[PDB]
């Protein structure tokens, strides 16, 4: 009857059930259009860092299209398997196989292309807000202008047309194959599988706690440990759902006797049998959630890392190594109404033996312990400490170094001079820096010696491992003032860019990690929405599968105000377990290696976890509103 | 209604707050828009929104209170006058339901009144052949057969009169006619009416009327006297019934006393009950027990009090206290 | 306990009205085993429905244990009908994901009876119906003659006032039917529980003490039995059916 | 219903639009906030507002349309399930008023039942006197006066029986009792009932019944036969009435023929009308014209067909067409 | 109508093969209500597939009303089943976006027939089934039994000759199942159309007149009712199934 009317009614019915699908499609099209418009913007080159700036957006776009193209293809194969009782009926009524295809592939192209056409119109309104968000994290005061950038339209249209062709191919393959006309007790294996899964997860957690502690110290021995940790955790997570929930469910069940209330009857019938059926999807969700949270948290810590480490890398506000350039810069500062405080200090490069002061293992070489390059400075130059003869004090913190190189209390240090050796003892480790990073190799600390000892050590001055400049010419600045014009003066001093400045090595790091945060945050948002929609589309089937149970339960006196109160806990257990496993994974991943980027945790991690939990909880709250409708019509 | 008002309008305050947050965010993320001015304007608009919400609540939460006080009370005018379109529909629904109720009730009452009128017409059509039978039969020669037939005819006529007065007791108030009534001719007529029963039962009558005139309605008072005399004759055998009327105080009192079986003291309070019958004898089963109830109910609009004094095995005394002359002036005024 | 005063029910779709209850009045004292039977298009099923709270009333009043049910709102009616009025259905109505010890103990979970006395009560009930050996067997593993004794045991634990049985022995063979009826009679005798049964089987009604022959929504005589043999009452009921 | 929604919630849109206008106007003048970067804010807010209005229209303007659909036509259940508190109050008030209407209907039914009970009470209280009068009358010695009294008594009894059958024909369907009836004893009983009128008018009956068995309701068939015989006797003077029953094919029939005045052909088709009276004779005023209607109406469920062949000055023929035996098997079995 | 002669179904996936059908001989006549009962593991679903000729037959000769099922092609087979056969399934298959009238008239709307005859057929069928009052409602707002009755009414509109039927009692309680079986029995007598139920419930098969018990193949061991009273026949069915 009136095939047009049938198609229209089916379209209006589909628009009511799958509205989250339409929302996800519109949001994905909006983000893709926004990124492609932003990539070709000529104002994107104001971002300067190691990453070019217009070659990271090109990577983000390609990474996003895969996340969208997997969700679309999985949703469109969940959908079609709920239209089989209609396909068989249409085949036995008398219709062919090339008319059902046209009936059910003309009620879907309308929805798809309407959502696509709406998404492009709402992807032009927010194209400038993305620019303005980017030009606030990586500090830039350029101007953003609203435009269309036609180049993005072609790309979006081509991409989504290709995805639609894939969907049509998959539907046509399904129709011709599954067409025809045809409309417990626990075992010993499950116990072993559950125990194995839990043991594997615990072992994977334990091994990661060592890594950069004392052992595995070889540039290739680490990779084996990392591969073992990842493989063990993934396999344990996969086996946690097949067998390790049935075991605990059996314990909880045969730990009650026979007294079960309505909530437990509704609960211990889904997650004993249906959580097992979904093992390859929940595993993916948990691992990718953990990855996103960990990466975002580390990228956030890298900010305060940048600030403090860039303050530490150059001791003074500026660093110089050529006397002519330094004198020219100070003359230029003189007439600029800027009074500079200048103080220089010579440094001695020598090797000493400190093998006896590490309390760890000999495997921590990083060079010969008896030939380590250290820096020696006088005691009159330092205005804070006044050591005595036969005494030495260390300098620098380098939170990485303490965790990797453990320093004992007072020991013995042998001065490896040409023909003499004066032993000293370790007094203590200081907290401030005194010399730039270039002289002290990577991050090796520096020692403090007495003026009397210096008076002879500088006289010795073995010229075998000395560098070009044994001095720390570096100009400070006056009290808090306008440092920007001083930076401009310094920039025009060095056309060869051979000197370093305090507030230019503290900007490349900010730009790089701000770009990283931007990309990871947007990809995490997209994956969050995708996983929420996919997990919401299964509770529909799980609900019309449990409809008979509600019917029988309502002839024994139970009312809707009790069935819904029991469903509100099943819908908590079905949505909370992957979240908790992902949170544990993230916590035990971040803590293992947080001392490689920054120097502070528990600040960003909590906030990222709370935001993720809030959005996931919205997507979880939206399903009781469907369970209520199912229960209402089962009298 | 504050909680109800803020649970019905929970979808507009959220929109307002989201709009404010969007404005603040877009102002924050730009360098060309000062933040402080936007903060000040957000604050001022929040306060003005509070005041606006107060006014709109006070204006809007009235008609529903009016309809909720309409549903369970005794005033149809509890609903206030609707002002916004979303109230006129509810008003129309209520008006339509009330109109349907009134129309159905009026039609049903009219139909039942017509049925009652047809029923009393049939009562008249039944009572007429009784008069025809009386006219045909008032030519007898045998004394005993004539006495028996007249007794039965008088019983049937009394039953028909009782039924007619039962029908008319619902509108006696529309039948009241206040005028002075000569007691002696009325009592003589009542005695002549019940002559056959006294002849068969050997019942005598003595008339002692100190008071000759009373103020009441002729027809209903005559019916009450006839009912009392019929009950006295039926409940008495071969005894003299004493009818006395005397003026006590400012009211006229009529006393009807017989020397019959009397009334049981346990049954004295229940003689005026509707449908009451004596349980001692099976001869009283055929008695309707409704004449006394009709007489007592019809006596109230006549301002006549019925007093009864009975002794078991000795006799029954019925007293009728006529009203004061000035007590009917208020009735005539209305 | 039960007392109805001139009940009346009219089944109509707002266009055609056909009354099926025409002034039924019944009188049941505490602790008797009565039955209702007669005809096939009569209102006996609707009579059983209206006596309980599963269906409403048009004209009449019904009293249970002194309390009145006609003038009650759905919340109070549901609460009262949960707290009393055990039900035995025609079909099993058993959940297939629980055991026998949990199906007949789930309804008793909204009264907070701890665990030990609940287990003791379950043992008491299951030792009389002979199902104590099936505490851990799922319903899809026992014969059809025991999945009805399970329902009866479920309906007997909370000690209700009146137990409404609607053709229990409808889909069983003679042996299981006789065994179930004997167990029901013993349960009635031990603890005083009123049982109202609707049946088409004269053998099923033989075990009762009183019988009511609803005919076109009327009374049409009423037997009383008393100190009489089961067989003789059976031929008496057979003769009464032959008359009707 | 766009206009109703816009007018009803007309004071909420003004607040948002006022805020936008104020922000634009202030940003116009102040030389610290750019004007090119605030139209963007206004634009985003406008889209959000429009989408919110469109999504809020359809969730609100539903119940007030369902009420209008419910208003007059049909489908008492058409009202949707309320969601907001105001909808709940409206629905509860409407349901309460409908329940009050149902209670009023129940009170009307109770009043009707009480009236029927009182009518039956009067019916028996009237039927006892006729039996008493018959018992007393069956002792007379005189001829002419006894004949007149019997005439009047039979007239009263026949009228009362007609009224009783008219009252009972509302529930006759629950009183039907069909069995084999012997025509001759029933006709003899009806003639003995009409003995007085037949003797006074000198009318005999010629009984020649070829068919002696009928299948119908004995009581109502006897009533119909008595009414037909009474009408034939009344409309005839000093004439013989012929009664013949014959087997016409598979159907039984009974004939009543009189040699009276007959009925005018212009009035013959209307004889069975309710209350139809012939104005040719002044004597027809006493005739109620309702016995024939009752006879025909009672013949309808019994499958009895009445054919009339009346000629003025010759007589009237009344024929009862009894049905076939097997036609009662669809009535007894179902 | 049809005849069964050595009805066998072939198999042979990978290496393991089963002989589910081992030769079937069935003789039935017009105006019958034959039921094919049995036990699990006998391939009753495969029996329906072979009997309905949905799957390609392997061996045996079957003549549906004088026409062999091996004498026509795939399109010819489809036309034959759509023009001569009707189906009723266990789970009702009714579109939720149609009405109770369009659902019934859908099979007859793909045949190019005038509106008057379709309206007459719908009126007579819905009047004889009792769903005519619900002529324009949706299957989302009707009870459980009315949906199955509509599904049964779909297959009775195009004047078939054999009405195949899977278990029409799977998702119905006692009252709905009894009403549906009574309606089917009434419809069988009016117009000649054979009904072949395949159920595992003695209550649903007690309304029949010819029961066949299949354990692994050709077994017969059949009852024939004749003049029973629907109760003795029920007990006989239960007894003869319990023996096996
Ligand atoms: C899976 C995780 C889900 C998280 C989803 C959050 C939204 C998606 C985000 C993209 C940007 C995420 C940025 C993370 C936090 C950035 C912190 C930050 O930038 O700090 C400061 C604040 O900067 C910002 O907040 C930039 C604005 C991003 C806020 C969150 C974005 C909300 C996105 C919703 C609106 C976007 C429209 C499109 C999506 C609906 C900047 O530094 P400063 O205060 O100027 O001081 C300079 C120091 N000398
Ligand atoms: C980066 C920024 C990009 C901009 C993002 C824009 C995307 C949001 C836009 C448009 C929403 C389109 C999706 C919903 C439209 C389809 C739903 C629909 O119209 O169905 C209508 C009713 O809709 C509904 O049932 C639910 C209404 C809720 C509105 C949709 C909610 C939007 C999505 C909420 C999801 C929240 C997740 C957010 C997570 C970050 C018709 O149904 P009916 O039963 O026939 O009632 C008729 C009334 N008498
Ligand atoms: C992040 C920039 C946002 C730009 C404006 C937002 C665009 C429109 C967004 C959604 C509008 C509201 C959609 C859902 C309304 C729900 C209505 C309801 O609660 O019944
Ligand atoms: C940061 C925003 C968080 C909250 C976002 C909520 C968006 C709207 C929520 C309601 C949408 C669905 C409500 C209707 C559902 C239904 O009718 O079935």
* Structure token pair of residue A234: 């993934």
What's the CA gap between C220 and D200, in Å, rounded? 49
CA-closest candidate to residue B296, choices B268, B273, B264, B265: B273
* Structure token pair of residue B288: 């309707």
CA-closest candidate to residue D229, choices D186, D175, D286: D186
Strand pairing report for E59-64 and A318-319: unpaired
A226 and chain E in contact, CB less than 8 A:
no
D149–B136: do the CB atoms touch at under 8 Å? yes
D30–B7: do the CB atoms touch at under 8 Å? no
Give the end-to-end CA distance of chain B in Å, rounded to a whole number. 50
What's the CA gap between C164 and C28, in Å, rounded? 13
CATH number of the CATH domain containing D187: 3.30.565.10
From residue E149, give the alpha-carbon distance in Å to each of A90, C40, E125. 20, 22, 11
* Structure token pair of residue A562: 């009790």
Q: How many CB atoms lie within 10 A of CB E36?
A: 23
A89–E54: do the CB atoms touch at under 8 Å? no
What's the CA gap between A490 and D16, in Å, rounded? 53
**C1-16 burial string, b = 16+ CB within 10 Å, else e?**
ebebeebbbeeeeeee
The side-by-side arrangement of strands in the sheet containing D315-321 is: D205-209, D241-248, D251-257, D315-321, D305-311
The side-by-side arrangement of strands in the sheet containing C87-88 is: C87-88, C162-166, C194-198, C33-37, C210-213, C222-223
Chains that touch D (3 or more CB pairs under 8 A): A, B
Chain E: residue nearest A13 by CA? Answer: E97
Query: How do the residues of chain B divide into helix, strand and coil, expressed in percent and rounded to 5?
Result: 60, 15, 25
Collect all residues with Cβ–Cβ distance below 8 Å to C95 and sequence separation of at least 6. Answer: A265, A549, A552, A553, C103, C106, C139
CB E95 within 8 A of CB E157: no
Name every chain B residue with its beta carbon within 8 A of the beta carbon of A129.
Answer: 26, 29
Point out the ligand nearest to the CA of residue B29. Answer: 1
D129–B119: do the CB atoms touch at under 8 Å? no
CB A246 within 8 A of CB A276: yes
Collect all residues with Cβ–Cβ distance below 8 Å to A486 and sequence separation of at least 6. Answer: A333, A336, A338, A477
Q: Which of A129, A137, A139, A145 has the most B C-beta neighbours within 10 Å, making it the best mutation to test the interface with B?
A: A129
CA distance A255 to chain D (A): 43
CA-closest candidate to residue E211, choices E244, E172, E173, E177: E244
What's the CA gap between D321 and C202, in Å, rounded? 46
What would the DSSP string read from start to end of A362-431? TT--SS-GGGEEEEEE-SSS-SS----TTEEEEE---HHHHHHS---SS--EEE--SS---EEEEEEE-S
Q: Cα torsion for C164, C166, C167, C169, to the nearest 10°?
A: -50
Q: Is the dihedral of CA A582, A585, A591, A592 positive or negative?
A: negative
E85 and chain C in contact, CB less than 8 A:
no
E113 and chain A in contact, CB less than 8 A:
no
Collect all residues with Cβ–Cβ distance below 8 Å to D272 and sequence separation of at least 6. Answer: D292, D293, D296, D306
* Structure token pair of residue C38: 């007669």
**B247-283 burial string, b = 16+ CB within 10 Å, else e?**
eeeebbbbbbbbbbbbbbeebbeebeeeebebeeeee
Q: How many CB atoms lie within 10 A of CB B220?
A: 23
- CA angle A503/A505/A509 to nearest 5° reads 115
Q: Do chains D and A touch (3 or more CB pairs under 8 A)?
A: yes
Q: Which of the 8 DSSP states describes residue B260?
A: S
Chain C: residue nearest A185 by CA? Answer: C138
Task: Establish how many alpha carbons lie within 13 A of residue E224's alpha carbon, considering only the half-sphere containing its beta carbon.
Answer: 3
What would the DSSP string read from start to end of A15-70? HHH-HHHHHHHHHHHHHHHHHHHHHT-GGGGG--SSS-STTTHHHHHHHHHHHHHH
Is C114 one of the annotated binding-site residues? no
The side-by-side arrangement of strands in the sheet containing E194-197 is: E85-88, E162-165, E194-197, E35-38, E211-214
Q: Domains in chain E, please, with CATH?
A: 2-243 (3.40.50.300)
Domain ranges of chain A: 1-183, 194-242, 262-314+505-635, 345-472
* Structure token pair of residue E230: 């629907």
Q: Residue A34, Cα to own-chain centre: how many angstroms? A: 22
SS3 C59: strand
Q: How many CB atoms lie within 10 A of CB A492?
A: 10
* Structure token pair of residue A279: 């093992």
* Structure token pair of residue A583: 């949170």
Chain D: residue nearest B88 by CA? Answer: D64
Phi, psi of C2 (to 5 degrees): -75, 140
- State the closest ligand 2 atom to the C-alpha of A619, by its place in the atom list counted from 1: 37
What's the CA gap between B129 and A419, in Å, rounded? 165
What's the CA gap between A474 and A315, in Å, rounded? 8
What's the CA gap between D315 and E41, in Å, rounded? 87
What's the CA gap between E238 and E234, in Å, rounded? 6
Q: Of the residues A622, A626, A628, A629, which should be mutated to test ligand 4's pocket, given the most ligand atoms within 8 Å of the CB?
A: A622
Collect all residues with Cβ–Cβ distance below 8 Å to C118 and sequence separation of at least 6. Answer: A259, C105, C108
CA-closest candidate to residue C78, choices C46, C56, C102, C60: C56
Strand partners, A395: A446
CB B41 within 8 A of CB D26: yes
What's the CA gap between D299 and A40, in Å, rounded? 100
CB C223 within 8 A of CB C200: no
Say which residue the tokens 């008030």 belong to: D93
Span from the CA of B24 to the centroid of ligand 2 (angstroms): 25
Name every chain A residue with its beta carbon within 8 A of the beta carbon of D47.
Answer: 125
Say which residue the tokens 């045809």 belong to: A182
Name every chain E residue with its beta carbon within 8 A of the beta carbon of C173.
Answer: 235, 238-239, 242
Task: Identify the helix (H) or strand (E) that includes residue A311.
Answer: helix A280-313
- State the closest ligand 3 atom to the C-alpha of A126, by its place in the atom list counted from 1: 2
Q: Where are the beta strands (DSSP E) in C171-237?
A: 194-198, 210-213, 222-223
What's the CA gap between E77 and E71, in Å, rounded? 9
Q: Where are the beta strands (DSSP E) in A475-529?
A: 500-501
Q: Which of D37, D38, D49, D55 has the most A C-beta neighbours within 10 Å, making it the best mutation to test the interface with A?
A: D37
Give the end-to-end CA distance of chain D in Å, rounded to a whole number. 55
Point out the ligand nearest to the CA of residue A9. Answer: 2
Q: Where are the beta strands (DSSP E) in chain B?
A: 179-182, 204-209, 213-216, 240-248, 251-258, 305-311, 315-321
Q: Of the residues A8, A10, A11, A16, which should be mutated to test ligand 2's pocket, given the most ligand atoms within 8 Å of the CB?
A: A16
Helix axes B143-168 and D85-137, enclosed angle (nearest 10): 170
Is C35 one of the annotated binding-site residues? no
* SS3 labels along A558-613: CCHHHHHHHHHHHHHHHHHHHHHHHHHHHHHHHHHHCCCCCCCCCCHHHHHHHHHH
CB A356 within 8 A of CB A426: no
What's the CA gap between A10 and A14, in Å, rounded? 6
What's the CA gap between B182 and B251, in Å, rounded? 16
Name every chain D residue with its beta carbon within 8 A of the beta carbon of A125.
Answer: 43-44, 47
Task: Establish how many alpha carbons lie within 13 A of residue D128's alpha carbon, considering only the half-sphere containing its beta carbon.
Answer: 11
Q: Do chains D and E touch (3 or more CB pairs under 8 A)?
A: no
Strand pairing report for E162-165 and E85-88: parallel
Q: How was this structure determined?
A: cryo-EM
Span from the CA of A501 to the centroid of ligand 1 (angstroms): 28
E87 and chain A in contact, CB less than 8 A:
yes
What's the CA gap between C216 and C220, in Å, rounded? 9
What's the CA gap between D292 and D290, in Å, rounded? 6
E74 and chain A in contact, CB less than 8 A:
no
What's the CA gap between A111 and A159, in Å, rounded? 17
What's the CA gap between C222 and C244, in Å, rounded? 13
CB C51 within 8 A of CB C38: no
| Burial class of residue D282 (count of CB atoms within 10 Å of its CB; 0-12, 13-18, 19+) | exposed
- Ligand 1 proximal residues by C-beta, below 6 Å: A 126, 129, 133, 136-137, 292, 296, 517-518, 521-522, 524-525, 528, 611-612
Q: Which of the 8 DSSP states describes residue D241?
A: E
Owning domain of residue D267: 134-333
Out of C87, C106, C135, whose CB is closest to A260?
A: C106
E133–C91: do the CB atoms touch at under 8 Å? no
Instruction: Give the resolution value in Å.
Output: 3.4
What's the CA gap between A42 and D334, in Å, rounded? 94
- C9: alpha, beta or left? (left if phi > 0; alpha if psi -120 to 50): beta
C145 and chain E in contact, CB less than 8 A:
no
């Amino acid at each position: 009857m009136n095939i047009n009317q049938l198609i229209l009614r089916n379209l209006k019915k589909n628009l009511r059930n799958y509205y989250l699908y339409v929302f996800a499609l519109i949001f994905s099209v909006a983000l893709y259009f926004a990124f492609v418009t932003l990539q070709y913007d000529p104002a994107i080159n104001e971002v300067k860092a190691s990453i070019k700036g217009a070659a990271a957006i090109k990577t983000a776009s390609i990474l996003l299209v895969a996340v969208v193209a997997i969700f679309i293809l999985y949703a469109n194969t969940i959908f079609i398997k709920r239209r089989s009782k209609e396909i068989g009926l249409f085949q036995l009524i008398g219709m062919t196989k090339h008319k059902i295809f046209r009936i059910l592939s003309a009620e879907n192209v309308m929805l798809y292309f309407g959502s696509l056409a709406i998404g492009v119109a709402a992807g032009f309104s927010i194209s400038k807000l993305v620019l303005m968000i980017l030009f606030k994290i990586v500090d830039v005061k350029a101007d953003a202008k609203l435009h269309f950038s036609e180049q993005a339209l072609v790309q979006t249209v081509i991409v989504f047309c290709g995805i639609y062709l894939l969907i049509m191919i998959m539907n046509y393959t399904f129709i011709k194959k599954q067409s025809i006309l045809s409309l417990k007790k626990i075992s010993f294996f499950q116990m072993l599988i559950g125990a194995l899964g839990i043991v594997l997860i615990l072992t994977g957690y334990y091994v990661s706690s060592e890594l950069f502690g004392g052992k595995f110290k070889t540039i290739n021995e680490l990779f084996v440990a990392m591969s073992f940790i990842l493989g063990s955790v993934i396999i344990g997570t996969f086996l946690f759902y097949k067998g390790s929930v049935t075991f605990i469910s059996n314990i909880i069940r045969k730990s009650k006797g026979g007294y079960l209330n309505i909530s437990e009857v509704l609960s211990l019938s889904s997650i004993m049998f249906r959580m097992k059926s979904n093992a390859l999807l929940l595993t993916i969700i948990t691992t990718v959630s953990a990855l996103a949270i960990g990466l975002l948290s580390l990228a956030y810590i890298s900010y305060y890392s940048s600030e403090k480490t860039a303050e530490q890398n150059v001791a003074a506000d500026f660093s110089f190594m050529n006397e002519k350039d330094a004198k020219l810069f100070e003359n230029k500062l003189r007439e600029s109404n800027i009074s500079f405080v200048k103080k220089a200090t010579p440094v001695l490069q020598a090797n000493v033996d400190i093998a006896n002061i590490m309390d760890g293992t000999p495997k921590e070489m990083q060079g010969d312990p008896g030939n380590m390059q250290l820096a020696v400075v006088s005691d009159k130059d330092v205005k804070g400490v006044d050591v005595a003869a036969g005494e030495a004090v260390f300098s620098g913190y380098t939170d990485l170094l303490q965790k990797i190189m453990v320093f004992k209390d007072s020991g013995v240090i042998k001065v490896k001079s040409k023909h003499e050796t004066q032993p000293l003892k370790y007094k203590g480790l200081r907290e401030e820096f005194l010399v730039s990073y270039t002289f002290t190799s990577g991050g090796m600390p520096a020692v403090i010696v007495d003026d009397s000892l210096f008076k002879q050590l500088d006289k010795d001055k073995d010229p075998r491992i000395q560098l070009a400049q044994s001095t720390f010419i570096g100009v400070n600045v006056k009290h808090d003032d306008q440092m920007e014009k001083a930076n401009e003066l310094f920039q025009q001093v060095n056309k060869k860019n051979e000197h370093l400045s305090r507030l230019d090595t503290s900007a490349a790091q900010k730009s790089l990690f701000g770009m990283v945060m931007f990309i990871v945050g947007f990809l995490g948002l997209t994956f969050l929405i995708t996983s929420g929609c996919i997990l919401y589309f299964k509770q529909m089937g799980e609900s019309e599968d449990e409809k008979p149970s509600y019917t029988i339960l309502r002839k024994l006196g139970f009312t809707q105000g009790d069935l819904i109160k029991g469903i509100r806990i099943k819908q908590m257990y079905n949505f909370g377990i992957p979240l908790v496993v992902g949170l544990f994974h993230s916590y035990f991943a971040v803590q293992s290696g947080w001392f490689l980027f920054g120097s502070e945790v528990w600040a960003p991690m909590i906030m990222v976890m709370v935001l993720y939990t809030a959005l996931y909880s919205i997507f979880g709250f939206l399903s009781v509103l469907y369970y209520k409708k199912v229960i209402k019509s089962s009298l | 209604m504050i909680k109800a008002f803020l649970i019905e309008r929970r979808s507009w305050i959220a929109a307002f707050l989201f709009q404010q947050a969007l404005m603040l965010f877009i102002a924050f993320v730009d360098p060309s828009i000062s933040f402080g001015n936007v903060l000040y304007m957000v604050y001022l608009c929040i306060l003005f929104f509070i005041i606006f919400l107060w006014f709109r609540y006070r204006k809007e939460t009235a008609f529903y209170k009016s309809l909720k006080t309409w549903e369970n009370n005794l005033d149809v005018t509890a609903i206030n006058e609707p002002e916004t379109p979303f109230e006129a529909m509810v008003e129309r629904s209520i008006a339509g339901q009330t109109e349907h109720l009134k129309q159905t009730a009026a039609r049903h009452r009219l139909a039942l009144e017509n049925e009652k009128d047809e029923l009393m017409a049939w009562i008249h059509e039944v009572k007429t052949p009784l008069t025809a039978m009386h006219l045909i039969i008032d030519r007898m020669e045998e004394k005993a057969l004539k006495s028996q037939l007249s007794y039965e005819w008088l019983r049937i006529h009394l039953l028909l009169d009782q039924q007619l007065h039962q029908k008319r007791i619902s509108f006696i108030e529309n039948d009241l006619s206040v005028e002075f009534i000569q007691l002696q001719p009325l009592i003589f007529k009542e005695i002549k009416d019940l002559q056959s029963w006294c002849i068969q039962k050997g019942i005598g009558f003595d008339i002692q009327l100190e008071a000759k005139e009373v103020l009441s309605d002729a027809k209903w008072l005559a019916f009450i006297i006839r009912q009392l005399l019929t009950n006295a004759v039926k409940y008495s055998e071969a005894s003299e019934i004493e009818i006395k009327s005397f003026q006590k105080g400012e009211q006229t009192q009529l006393q009807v006393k017989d020397c019959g079986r009397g009334i049981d003291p346990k049954d004295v309070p229940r003689i005026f009950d509707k449908g009451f019958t004596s349980t001692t004898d099976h001869h009283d089963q055929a008695s309707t027990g409704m004449g006394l109830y009709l007489a007592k109910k019809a006596a109230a609009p006549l301002l006549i009090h019925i007093d009864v004094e009975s002794e078991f095995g000795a006799g029954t005394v019925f007293t009728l206290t006529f009203p004061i002359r000035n007590q009917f002036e208020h009735v005539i005024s209305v | 306990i039960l007392e109805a005063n001139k009940i009346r029910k009219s089944y109509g779709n707002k266009l055609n009205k056909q009354e099926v209850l025409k002034g039924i009045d019944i009188h049941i004292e505490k602790g008797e085993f009565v039955s209702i039977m007669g005809a096939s298009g009569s209102g006996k099923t609707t009579l059983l429905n209206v006596l309980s709270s599963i269906d409403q009333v048009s004209h009449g009043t019904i009293h249970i244990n002194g309390n009145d049910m006609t003038a009650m709102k759905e919340k109070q009616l549901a609460e009262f009908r949960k707290q009393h009025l055990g039900f035995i259905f025609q079909d099993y109505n058993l959940l297939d994901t629980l055991t026998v010890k949990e199906n007949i103990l789930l309804p008793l979970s909204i009264t907070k009876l701890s665990k030990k006395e609940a287990n003791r009560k379950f043992e008491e009930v299951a030792k009389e119906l002979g199902i104590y050996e099936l505490r851990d067997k799922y319903p899809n593993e026992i014969s059809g003659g025991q999945k009805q004794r399970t329902s009866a045991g479920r309906a007997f634990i909370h000690d209700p006032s009146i137990i409404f049985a609607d053709e229990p022995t409808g889909a069983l063979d003679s042996k299981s039917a006789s065994d179930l009826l004997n167990k029901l009679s013993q349960l009635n005798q031990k603890r005083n529980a009123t049982i109202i049964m609707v049946t088409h089987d004269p053998v099923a009604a033989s075990y009762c003490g009183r019988v009511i022959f609803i005919k076109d929504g009327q009374m049409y005589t009423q037997l009383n039995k008393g100190g009489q043999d089961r067989q003789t009452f059976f031929q008496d009921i057979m003769k009464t059916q032959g008359v009707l």
